[PDB]
Design a protein around this ligand. Structure first.
Ligand SMILES: Nc1ccn([C@@H]2O[C@H](COP(=O)(O)OP(=O)(O)OP(=O)(O)O)[C@@H](O)[C@H]2O)c(=O)n1
Lengths: 227, 234
């Protein structure tokens, strides 16, 4: 079975800001609603915003019975595991279950990205949505001087969705210590650190994350430009 | 002395590595190249602003300078090289044959299609190059960076706090860059697309100067639409 997990547990908080007279969260959700194969599309948000989010869905005439709003966690991976735990306590986990986890503030993902994510999770178990690194990547351990500059052709910018077999995600995450979880910049590293493969799905240059005011200006350009 | 080297070699196509003259595309009724140059003319401390571009584009570059009334006596157009680093060295060699290199000379090298750099970025580059010899303009990674050696599976996912997206300008004390570059083999002349990697690979420090989220490289139609937004709005 196929599940969507829309991650709105972050901090008016950026996931509810208006983008073209419709909240960013709604733009993303609309993309997930058009996929009929999700058994449930689970939105996780902070406790104080859950009823407000449900109300905002009602405001935009979205009544799809597949949508459930749940309480998120204290960090991003805590939120993903909250969604899996909700699934486990509601439906139980099937051996073939997959979860498509996705940033609420990335409203410009496409049908193709979701379908490739779904298919990639079913076939290989774990997948990251990426594009070729737009810049040369440079590293630093002191924030003052370069430590290393890797070969540019091996570098990718991680985006979302990130998609997983639910049992694989649960068991892998269960293996990590609290310190090992302290560094995880994303969810796919849970899998990498537990020595299972993570597949690549190509994103889009316009699949941006709205985290600064600049990103909202770029997003407005993306929407008015139709892309 | 302080020199600017504006790198106008084009943007290579995935298949063929054909140079496309993206710097001549229109951004609000002025070529991208003209916006970038206008940013450099405002820095009074530059002794020369040398644009190096392929031989086949030099006349059109000069014609474009004329059409947009760019009359600054410091602007000069020269022939570029076989790759980005060879073009940088074409600029260095031109400086040496014209004025001669001083021990304190620095060169601020910059992508022609990065028109949104700021006065602060340029001044900080100059100061950092004078004091420390080598500088990369960078921003904190916003995305998690992931690696792949086969374009199919992840190889590693490093700590995001240590990852940065490199931009330009990249600025160097000229004799230092020359000495470091002179240390590289003919083979390493092919891999190193980046100019700061010359220095890193030759075991000299490179300072970080922080860039801007909007200091984008205008290389795609998508990037061009966003650039039109950035420009119209500030
Ligand atoms: N405990 C958390 C933290 C983040 N996210 C979501 O992960 C996505 C990525 O946003 P990010 O860049 O990681 O930043 P935030 O943690 O949301 O907030 P800040 O801008 O302060 O970093 C966001 O949609 C966020 O809502 C989440 O679901 N639960």
């Amino acid at each position: 079975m196929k599940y969507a997990g829309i991650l709105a547990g972050g901090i008016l908080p950026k996931q509810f800001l208006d983008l073209d007279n419709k909240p960013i969260l709604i733009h993303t959700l609309e993309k997930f609603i058009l996929i009929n194969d999700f058994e449930k599309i689970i939105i996780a948000t902070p406790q104080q915003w859950m009823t407000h989010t449900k109300d905002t869905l009602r405001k935009f005439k979205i009544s799809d019975e597949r949508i459930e709003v749940i309480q998120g966690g204290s960090d991003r991976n805590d939120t993903i595991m909250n969604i899996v735990k909700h699934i486990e306590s509601t439906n139980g986990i099937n051996d073939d279950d997959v979860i498509v986890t996705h940033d609420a503030v990335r409203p410009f993902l496409t049908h193709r990205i979701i379908k490739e994510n779904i298919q990639a999770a079913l076939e290989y178990g774990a997948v990251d949505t990426v594009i070729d690194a737009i810049d040369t990547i440079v590293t630093s351990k002191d924030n003052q001087t370069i430590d290393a500059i890797p070969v540019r052709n091996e570098m990718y910018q991680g985006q979302t969705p990130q998609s997983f077999n639910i049992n694989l995600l649960k068991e892998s995450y269960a293996q990590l210590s609290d310190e090992q979880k302290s560094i995880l910049s994303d969810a796919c590293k849970i899998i990498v650190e537990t020595n299972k493969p993570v597949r690549l799905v190509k994103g889009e240059l316009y699949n941006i994350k709205v985290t600064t005011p600049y990103d909202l200006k770029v997003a407005n350009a993306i929407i008015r430009g139709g892309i």
